[model samples]
Target: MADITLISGSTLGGAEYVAEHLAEKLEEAGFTTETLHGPLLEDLPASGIWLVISSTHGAGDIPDNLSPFYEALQEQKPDLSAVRFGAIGIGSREYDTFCGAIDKLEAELKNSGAKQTGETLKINILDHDIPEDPAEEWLGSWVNLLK
Candidate 1:
């Protein structure tokens, strides 16, 4: 069984790259990892943690690939009382609702009864540096916090 589940829903290349790196690092830290590209599952393993990495699409919408899963998550309302999660959101500050998709995603998780292991970290791409870089830093701190 996996020890951590990494979820990614990004329209931006940088966001996807960050999610991949996060999964790699978490695996290196001795946690089994399962990655999905859309909405989260209700029956996530009780022994593991859930990590969400996503980017806001047009006007704060979820990525195209993740639409179905996101819709399901909204309609089904899974019971996630036994789960713990962390979120990392990537977006351009130029956008109207920077990282808004992540905001909704995090809310959904909490609404479904998941406990937040830490705060959701947002990365703005308009800063001119790599968005993934900050995610790497935040992820390291998050790992330490989990420990």
Candidate 2:
């Protein structure tokens, strides 16, 4: 059980960048961390916090990189009652269902019995300088909730 597990589902690297950036900060804060390209339906951490950073792609669908995991996860419905987690969504607000992938992930986590801390953070590609800046600011306070 690492102190933190950072997972991401990114197409254009936005979500992955956010996870890595936050991981750097979390390590500085004295946490042991690991990362995965999500949604990891298998090989879940036995314990510790899971941070999901994902982006919606193609009509607000889950990113192609994570499609296999998502498809398998629904069938597995693996237990996650011991997991505590949070998510950040990266997307273009111009889309009809902006950040919809994040929403789906959050709901699935809940269904699997994982607990969430704080609200779902959304980063609009057009709104921020980069997802990094806003995510870093949010992670400043978000890290506290994990403990």
Candidate 3:
């Protein structure tokens, strides 16, 4: 029903594919979608729906590809009260920094006044061979919440 922007930050490409796959599902469910890989903060609309998929890298840091956008959000601190978003995090549970990037992302967005629409889905990569499978499962409820 809403135009959902799918943003992804990936290191080895897993998160990128996950974002693409989710965009397809969202389109199939009758919502308009746009997929952006490591997009800048200005690339996004001033207000609308967003689905951010990211993986932690290098000791609880956001992947290099996504860092600029994250930093922009932190520095600019735009008023994003009109934006609603969902988050998907991919990381290894064995690591203590698991899903750390997504946690930071959620916090940053919240700090800028963006409303989180659903629970943040953190996929333990060690457990799922194809991260998209679990992400797709989580997307079901997330999609329903969009309306």
Candidate 4:
């Protein structure tokens, strides 16, 4: 299995940027990494670490770019017991269900038996001009959690 698979679910591209930033740090920390934007379940490997970086849409919906993948997971319920994951959610605090997309995705992953590595990082866009900054900072500690 690859060391890390960075999966991104972006609406206005913020989540994608964070995923790329984290992948660079993970590589520097000596881990192999692959970054996938809106990847389907079949696009993912059988088992490995998956870092999901996503942004919420209207209310609490997943971004359109990522809905298909999320839908597939809900439909297939593929075995993911061998998978370990980390999650980062980007959204505006103005919304009551801020970062809800990541929460839903994490729940689905758990239902499929995928274990989470570290605590989920929720980045409020209102707090940062560039979301990648906090995301990179969070990765500083998160990378250590990987075995």
Q: Which number leads on lDDT? A: 3
Candidate 3 residue lDDT tens string, 52-112: 7765433234353355666677788888898887766633323334434345656777888
Weakest ten-residue segment in model 2 by summed lDDT: 90-99
Measured over all alpha carbons after superposition, the RMSD of each candidate to the real structure, in angstroms, is: 4.9, 4.6, 4.5, 4.5
List lDDT for all candidates, in order: 0.59, 0.59, 0.63, 0.62
lDDT of 2 at 21: 67
TM-score per candidate, in order?
Answer: 0.67, 0.69, 0.72, 0.71
lDDT (0-100) at residue 3 of candidate 1? 76
Residue 101 of candidate 4: its Cα lDDT? 37
Runs in model 3 lying further than 4 Å from the true structure: 10-14, 57-65, 90-102, 122-133
Looking at model 4, residue 51 earns an lDDT score of 74
Model 2 C-alpha lDDT per residue in residues 1-147, reported as the tens digit of each score: 457777765532335665676677779987876665654433346366777666543434435334655556577766778877776663332332443434555567679878777765554443453232355555667767555
Worst 10 residues of 3 by lDDT: 90-99
Clashing pairs in 2: none
Quote the lDDT for 109 in model 1.
63
By TM-score, how accurate is candidate 4? 0.71
